[PDB]
Amino acid sequence: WTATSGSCKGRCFELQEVGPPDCRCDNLCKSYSSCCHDFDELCLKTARGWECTKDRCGEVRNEENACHCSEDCLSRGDCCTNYQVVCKGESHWVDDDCEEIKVPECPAGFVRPPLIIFSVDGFRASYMKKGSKVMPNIEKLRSCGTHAPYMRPVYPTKTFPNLYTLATGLYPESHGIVGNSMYDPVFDASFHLRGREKFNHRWWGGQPLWITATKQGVRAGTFFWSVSIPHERRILTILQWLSLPDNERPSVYAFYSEQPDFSGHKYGPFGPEMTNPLREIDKTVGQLMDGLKQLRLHRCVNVIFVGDHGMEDVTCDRTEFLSNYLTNVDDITLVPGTLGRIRAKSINNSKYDPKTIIAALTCKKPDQHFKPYMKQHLPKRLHYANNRRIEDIHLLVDRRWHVARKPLDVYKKCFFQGDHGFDNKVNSMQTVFVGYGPTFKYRTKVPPFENIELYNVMCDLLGLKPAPNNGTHGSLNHLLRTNTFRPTMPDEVSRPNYPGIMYLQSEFDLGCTCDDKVENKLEELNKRLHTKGSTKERHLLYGRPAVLYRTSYDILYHTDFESGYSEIFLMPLWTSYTISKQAEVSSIPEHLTNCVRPDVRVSPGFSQNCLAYKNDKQMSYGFLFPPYLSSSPEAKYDAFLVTNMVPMYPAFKRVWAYFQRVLVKKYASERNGVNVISGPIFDYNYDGLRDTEDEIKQYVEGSSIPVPTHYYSIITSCLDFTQPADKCDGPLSVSSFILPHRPDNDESCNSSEDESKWVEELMKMHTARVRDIEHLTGLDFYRKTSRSYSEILTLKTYLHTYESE
């Protein structure tokens, strides 16, 4: 109940929400059915429209008008945005040359430059180039300020997950808004785009920017705009708040536009009908900038022009139907569209089985346009698993397609020609970023980055300390003229041991054998030096990774590779090696096929054993430094050490062997040498974070050898590929992956074929940031380079996407 018979007199778009059943006058009252009786009349004026004309100049103030052209309007803060232009001979902001804003030029009483976030729904990255002719204000912001060619949204590439990620710096799995539709089994409650439940605060986790600001003494304008409030009024309201007295005036504001998304759904991303919505958005930007210029704020305010996701061509005929795969279609609930989420229709039905649902959806048709996953097997770069609102069964839908349960769902619901929601690496889903103002750089292009990074920057822009989030603070310092955040490297927590030769061969009873008894002062001093770390500067190019948790581990040096060997997990945490352009690939000699050698630097009690692999009929083993890339027949023996061995399903060895035998050398050829760091990852609770030992759910049968859920590699070279990886003077280039360690290759539908037809495609799908691997391992890489730390942070957030231009 609301007693809607109070009044909005003097209260229009009040910043503090009043408690029911007192009537509300805030920009949210419309959404709650709670506005005072006179809200429309007082707060949503429209008389005479939105622009001054010649005949209105210096008019007598009429309080009925939408905006004003009277002499007193500047001091009242309520002129039409074009008042100075029409009535005072001023130029529009877009017609002024751009001039570097070296320092904030703010009216007296402003303690800090305000921030205005101008967010646009469905604004695909390529609109910046393709619509440039019809967006002169946006193009001026873009060319004069700081911009990226595109900004990567989060998955799923839907509106609320992305806007709330912008507000919090969190992955959807952590902020809780994991889709546009949700069921929370703990609450036993559902969240929908339509309706009231979406306004309940228990859906919205983390700490959004307006709360961060308020808690730290910075006032905030409202972020949510009720749909029926026209754009012109949103702008005028922001401008009015900006004329408040110093103690009442917010420092952070948001505008939101439902366009171009709204039209994009109806006409497709490049429909001829799309030109008009882009013109209209640009005109709105023009109104804001003219309005700031009138208030002498146009060289004071930082403006961020940012999208939530792009838009792809998607029509009704490109719909796959679960009814063409499943007999039990009525025993399942599907969240449909550009992604699929499946759960049982009834928790009372114990005959429901996810295993057989997945199998029935796996590689069943030759051109199948979706791929089923258990959520923990989704590419780790999506960070889409650790939330009870994300169903165990997930369908990754191909770009341009939909998934639906039954045909009737689609024609009893062609309407649409566009949609979004797909994998956040897809080009059509990419969106925009422009920063313009005293705190941003002048005429600067920056590399593409992920929207999870912006919360930290918005906090820096406002002098706020960010709540804990998934950004990497400092990685976007290169966007900023000032207010940078000067992070330090995390402290190493565990220092390594450097074991020498401490064990005789006969002390080991591991059930391993090797044909290696084949017997020189020249080359005995030589081998000693290699074991003491003489080639270490060649194979460990950026310093050893720091171990950021408490553990027991040994550094092991070898001619061709260096490793950090965990006495707790019985295998390396990391193995580092450099492969120059000239390096030669060789084979595993016949007499060494099953060779595994005790490492006399490491106790039997802290070693793996061969008997466990023999006894474990599902589990085989592989090596982290590949024997194929040994520098000499003699160095090859090092690669067969029990300390270089890791557990691998035979199905996974097909992947790994092709990566090590073919792909590493290909990359070294193309990139002029690579440095490779590889290792295991344990993430049994799919939280994106390193497992402790007591979280490991699987061991090699009969042993304490833990089975990794994934294997990583980080592959680094010189960005200037005229320089070899091991002699690089400037910026680095990186690509990484986190491959799932799976006992089958069901994910790859062409796996019966030669590895050359499917392996590299799988690795591309599981591309990762170095930062993703840092979370998963508790390691910190690139500790010793000649580069600035902020530059290294940017490198650690890089994602190699393998999309075209």
Ligand X SMILES: *[C@@H]1O[C@H](CO)[C@@H](O[C@@H]2O[C@H](CO)[C@@H](O[C@@H]3O[C@H](CO[C@H]4O[C@H](CO)[C@@H](O)[C@H](O[C@H]5O[C@H](CO)[C@@H](O)[C@H](O)[C@@H]5O[C@H]5O[C@H](CO)[C@@H](O)[C@H](O)[C@@H]5O)[C@@H]4O)[C@@H](O)[C@H](O[C@H]4O[C@H](CO)[C@@H](O)[C@H](O)[C@@H]4O[C@H]4O[C@H](CO)[C@@H](O)[C@H](O)[C@@H]4O)[C@@H]3O)[C@H](O)[C@H]2NC(C)=O)[C@H](O)[C@H]1NC(C)=O
Ligand Y SMILES: Cc1cc(OCc2ccncn2)c(C(C)(C)C)cc1Cl
- Residues near Zn ion, by CB under 5 A: 261
Instruction: Name the binder of 180 from Zn ion, Cl ion, Ca ion, none, CB < 5-8 A by kind.
Output: Cl ion
Confirm or reject binding of residue 163 to ligand Y (CB under 6 A).
yes
Q: Cα(103)–Cα(439) distance, rounded to whole angstroms?
A: 8
**Token pair of 750 as six digits:** 């062409």
**Which residue out of 159, 237, 431, 472 is catalytically annotated?**
159
Using the contact rule CB under 5 A, the part of the chain among 120-128, 205-213, 391-399, 516-524 near Ca ion is 120-128
Answer yes or no whether residue 354 interacts with ligand X by CB under 6 A: no
Instruction: Kindly tell me which residue out of 93, 155, 164, 241 binds ligand Y, with binding defined by CB under 6 A.
Output: 164
Q: Report, in Å, the least distance between residue 165 CB and ligand Y.
A: 8
Q: Residues 566, 581: contact at Cβ < 8 Å?
A: no
Partner interacting with residue 167 (select from Ca ion, ligand Y, ligand X, none; CB below 5-8 Å by kind)? ligand Y
The DSSP annotation for 402-433 comes to EEESSTHHHH-----SEE--S-TT-GGG-B-E
Shortest approach of ligand X to residue 634 CB, angstroms? Answer: 43
What residues form DSSP beta bridges with 678? 575, 713
DSSP helix/strand/coil, 764? helix
Breaks, C-N > 2.5 A, in the chain lie after: 413, 519
State yes or no: is 159 an active-site residue: yes
In the list Zn ion, Ca ion, Na ion, none, the entry touching 685 (Cβ below 5 to 8 angstroms by class) is: Ca ion
- Residue 115 interacting partner from ligand Y, Na ion, Ca ion, none (CB closer than 5 to 8 Å by kind): none
SS3 letters across 19-88: CCCECECCCCHHHHCCECCCHHHHHCCCECCCCCCHHHCCCCCCCCECCECCCCHHHHCCECCCHHHHHH
608 binds Cl ion (CB under 5 A): no
- Residue 179 contacts which entry, Cl ion, Zn ion, ligand X, none (Cβ below 5-8 A, type-dependent): Cl ion
Q: Which of 78, 121, 139, 173 binds ligand X (CB under 6 A)?
A: 173
Asked if 436 contacts 146 with a C-beta cutoff of 8 angstroms, the reply is yes
Tallying the residues shown for the chain, one arrives at 805
Give the binding-site size for ligand X (rule: CB under 6 A): 18
DSSP state of 590: G
The DSSP line for 334-370 is EE-BSEEEEEES-TT-TT--HHHHHHHHSS-STT-SE
Candidates 221-229, 421-429, 468-476, 487-495: pick the segment binding ligand X (CB under 6 A).
468-476
User: Please, which residue, 174 or 607, has the CB nearer to ligand X?
Assistant: 174
Site string for Cl ion, 144-183 (x = CB under 5 A): -----------------------------------xx---
**Binding-site residue ranges for 1-tetradecanoyl-sn-glycerol 3-phosphate:** 159, 180, 261, 420
User: Per CB under 6 A, which region of 36-44, 379-387, 425-433, 557-565 contacts ligand X?
Assistant: 379-387
Q: Does 621 bind Na ion (CB under 5 A)?
A: no
Nearer to ligand Y, 455 or 565 (CB): 455
Which three-class secondary structure state does DSSP give residue 122? coil
Interface with ligand Y includes 162 (CB under 6 A)? no
Give yes or no for residue 613 binding Na ion (CB under 5 A): yes
Is 83 a binding residue for ligand Y by CB under 6 A? The answer is no
Q: Is 26 exposed, middle or buried (0-12, 13-18, 19+ CB in 10 A)?
A: buried
When the beta carbons of 310 and 673 are compared against Ca ion, the nearer one is: 310
Binding range to ligand Y, per CB under 6 A, among 127-135, 157-165, 233-241, 728-736:
157-165
DSSP E strand boundaries for 74-122:
115-121
394 binds ligand X (CB under 6 A): no
Taking phi over 0 as left and psi of -120 to 50 as alpha, with beta for the rest, 24 belongs to beta
Helix orientation angle between 275-294 and 136-144, rounded to the nearest 10 degrees: 60
The residue within the footprint of Na ion, chosen from 146, 386, 745, 767 (CB under 5 A), is 745
Annotated binding site for Zn(2+): 121, 159, 261, 265, 308-309, 420
Q: Which secondary-structure segment (H or E) carries 255?
A: strand 252-260
The stretch among 140-148, 168-176, 706-714, 735-743 that binds ligand X (CB under 6 A) is 168-176
Considering the rule CB under 5 A, would residue 685 count as an interface residue with Ca ion?
A: yes
Which residues make Cβ contacts (< 8 Å) with residue 337, sequence separation at least 6? 397, 402, 403, 404, 419, 421
Please report, for the chain, how many H helices and E strands are present, in that order. Answer: 23, 29
13 contacts 27 by C-beta, under 8 angstroms: yes
User: Where do runs of H (alpha helix) occur along 412-520?
Assistant: 454-461
The two beta strands, 732-740 and 710-718, are antiparallel
Residue of 596, 570, 577 lying closest to 660 (CA atoms): 577
d(CA 761, CA 754): 12
Closer residue to Ca ion in complex, CB, 121/398 = 121
Contact 683, 740 (CB under 8 A): no
* CB nearer Ca ion, residue 261 or residue 638: 261
**# of chain residues touching ligand Y (CB under 6 A):** 12
Select the residue interacting with Na ion from 26, 616, 755, 772 (CB under 5 A): 616
Which regions of 559-629 does DSSP assign to beta strands (E)? 562-566, 571-579, 620-623
**What's the rounded Cα separation, in Å, for the pair 657 and 25?**
66
Nearest CB to Ca ion, comparing residues 474 and 708: 708
Which positions ≥6 away from 72 have C-beta within 8 Å? 61
Under rule CB under 6 A, residue 475 binds ligand X: no
Alpha-carbon gap, residue 381 to 782, rounded angstroms: 20
Our finding on whether 371 is near ligand X (CB under 6 A) is: no
Binding flag, residue 490, ligand X (CB under 6 A): no
Q: Which of 87/163 has CB closer to ligand Y?
A: 163
Closest approach of Ca ion to the CB of residue 766, in Å:
17
Binding residues: 121, 159, 180, 261, 265, 308-309, 420, 683, 685, 687, 689, 691
State the nearest-atom distance from the C-beta of 320 to Zn ion, in Å.
20
Among 27, 137, 212, 387, binds ligand X (CB under 6 A): 387
Q: Which does 343 bind (CB under 5 to 8 A by kind): Zn ion, Ca ion, ligand X, none?
A: none
Tell whether residue 689 is a contact of Ca ion (CB under 5 A): yes
Q: Which is nearer to ligand X, 367 or 694 (CB)?
A: 694
**3-class secondary structure, 471:** coil
With a CB cutoff of 8 Å and minimum separation 6, the contacts of 580 are: 668, 673, 724, 725, 726
Measured distance CA(111)–CA(250) in Å, rounded = 11
Rounded CA-CA distance 627/640 in Å is: 7
For residue 711, the one-letter residue type is Y
Backbone torsions φ then ψ of 595, nearest 5 degrees: -70, 125
Stretch that binds Na ion, among 76-84, 507-515, 580-588, 606-614 (CB under 5 A): 606-614
Residues 197-236 that bind ligand X (CB under 6 A): 205-206
Cβ distance to ligand Y smaller for residue 31 or 709 = 31
Taking CB under 5 A as the criterion, the residue among 273, 687, 746, 791 binding Ca ion is 687
Report yes or no: 381 and 757 within 8 Å, Cβ to Cβ.
no
Place of tokens 């002498």: 296
The binder of ligand X chosen from 162, 251, 386, 472 (CB under 6 A): 386
Q: Beta strand pairing status for 302-307 and 115-121?
A: parallel
Residues 312-341 close enough to bind ligand Y by CB under 6 A: none
Residue with structure tokens 């691998």? 648
Residues 106-125 that bind ligand Y (CB under 6 A): 117, 119
Residues forming contacts to ligand Y in the complex (CB under 6 A) are 117, 119, 160, 163-164, 166-167, 223-225, 254, 256
Catalytic positions, written as ranges: 159
**Footprint of Ca ion (CB under 5 A):** 121, 159, 261, 308, 683, 685, 687, 689, 691
* Binding residues vs Na ion (CB under 5 A): 613, 616, 619-620, 745, 748, 751
Which residues of the shown chain bind Cl ion in the complex (CB under 5 A)?
Answer: 179-180
Binding site for ligand X (CB under 6 A): 170-171, 173-176, 205-206, 383, 386-387, 468-470, 687-689, 775
